[PDB]
């Protein structure tokens, strides 16, 4: 046991298990050239660099899986929510940390992954005749995430059977629980909007269904804690 403390926050997470650094790159600030050359972007090191602990989601024998959209997820709660709202341009890396409190008498496996530009696609009506672009609920599901309706096709006709081709980490209950992923800023632009375009999505699906002999707490809590690595903003409003 060893509790990391970076900010007015103090998560009592494991000493130092294995963390998957995304696409093999630590999120950093910027050389000296961007979508702003006579506009030196202030780099929030203040309260924009602490631990955020999203409202734990409950895993049932039936959860289809969940997903969050960055940077949206936090533009809500937080002083990082203060920045993302009062600023025009934005660039920031991350570091998610998904924990699972369960007993040795439970069992399951969660695939946790980061998928850049995660574009959803609802039923398209019901059978497939309605160009209805998903609600403002599926495009930016705040800090409480959103559930997958068709886990198999990740809600975008792509097979989850191949999701591991993204920065991912497994969470097999009989072997661990906490899993970590350091995401670097991935975009086709140095500085992009932090309110309309969501640089990516964090998925967390039960590949091996949760289960327990009858009599154990049936819902295992999944606690997602994240830390904004190298925030950057330009021009306030």
């Amino acid at each position: 046991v060893a509790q990391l403390t970076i900010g007015n926050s103090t998560i009592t997470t494991q000493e130092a298990a294995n963390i998957i650094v995304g696409y093999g790159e630590w999120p950093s600030y910027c050389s000296d050239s961007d979508a702003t050359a006579v506009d030196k972007p202030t780099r929030p090191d203040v309260s924009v660099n602490r631990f955020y602990t999203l409202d734990t989601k409950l895993w049932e024998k039936s959860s289809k899986g969940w997903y969050w959209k960055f940077p949206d997820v936090l533009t809500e709660t937080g002083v990082f929510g203060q920045n993302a709202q009062f600023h025009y341009l934005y660039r920031s890396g991350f570091c998610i940390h998904v924990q699972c409190n369960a007993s040795k008498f439970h069992q399951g496996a969660l695939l946790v992954a980061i998928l850049p530009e995660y574009v959803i696609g609802t039923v398209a009506g019901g059978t497939g005749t309605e160009d209805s672009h998903p609600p403002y609920k599926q495009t930016q599901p705040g800090a409480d995430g959103f559930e997958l309706q068709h886990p198999y096709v990740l809600d975008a006709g792509i097979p989850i059977s191949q999701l591991t081709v993204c920065p991912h980490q497994w969470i097999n209950l009989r072997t661990n629980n906490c899993a970590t992923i350091i995401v670097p800023y991935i975009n086709a632009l140095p500085f992009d909007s932090a309110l309309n375009h969501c640089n990516f999505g964090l998925l967390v699906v039960p590949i091996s269904p949760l289960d327990y002999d009858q009599g154990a707490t049936p819902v295992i809590p999944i606690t997602i804690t994240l830390a904004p690595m190298c925030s950057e903003f330009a021009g306030l409003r």
Partner: protein, 218 residues
């Protein structure tokens, strides 16, 4: 065994047919001996699925124009293919001062002459094109649609003041070159619904691939 056939340029090369304009002498479609084709690399069926293997791409393209009659015949008709750089307005009439504006590269060639070919550079004002855009470009549903990814517009037409003498069919081939891809993503496994978004049949979800009887019986 040389791992060269597995590169990116060797995967995405090869001139594919992406467009087929049609200038019937008389009929419905393109009743003015001219038509506007928006560069769309999905003009090639299986291309979508492929490029969509990545999230960010960068490339140039060599377009080739094979024009003839519906029969496949060669004829002494002179054509003019014009390029509308994403940002400039397109022709609307058979002599909109659009075909006149120099900043719109045109290329005259007769059907006698071998196919006409030209190279379009990586347009986009972004670092790269991006097949996915998880947001809205800061009434209507503007989701998933990425602005700057527009490669331009080719406007085919029979040179001259009057209509053409024979019916024509211009086929447009495009081979992309010097490719760079990024962020590999899962391979589409549900039929495509619209050229727009990634929506799929919300009930007609089939398994990624064929299925069998029992897991023990091979």
């Amino acid at each position: 065994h040389s791992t060269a056939e597995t590169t990116l340029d060797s995967f995405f090369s090869r001139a594919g047919l992406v467009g087929e304009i049609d200038l019937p002498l008389e009929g419905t479609t393109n009743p003015n001996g001219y038509a506007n084709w928006d560069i769309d690399i999905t003009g090639y069926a299986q291309m979508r699925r492929k490029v969509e293997l990545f999230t960010y791409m960068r490339f140039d393209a060599e377009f080739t124009f094979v024009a003839c009659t519906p029969t496949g015949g060669v004829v002494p008709q002179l054509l003019q293919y014009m390029f509308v750089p994403p940002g400039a307005p397109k022709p609307d009439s058979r002599e909109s001062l659009a075909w006149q504006t120099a900043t719109n590269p045109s290329v005259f060639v007769k059907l006698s002459d071998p196919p006409a070919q030209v190279s379009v550079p990586f347009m986009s004002p972004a670092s790269a094109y991006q097949w996915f855009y998880d947001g809205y470009p800061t009434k209507d549903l503007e989701y998933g649609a990425c602005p700057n990814n527009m490669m331009g517009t080719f406007s085919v037409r029979t040179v001259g003041t009057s209509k053409s003498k024979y019916p024509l069919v211009v086929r447009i081939y495009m081979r992309m070159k010097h490719v760079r891809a990024w962020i590999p993503r899962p391979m589409r496994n549900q039929n495509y619904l619209f050229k727009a978004n990634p929506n799929y049949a919300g009930n007609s979800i089939k398994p990624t691939g064929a299925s069998r009887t029992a897991i023990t019986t091979l």
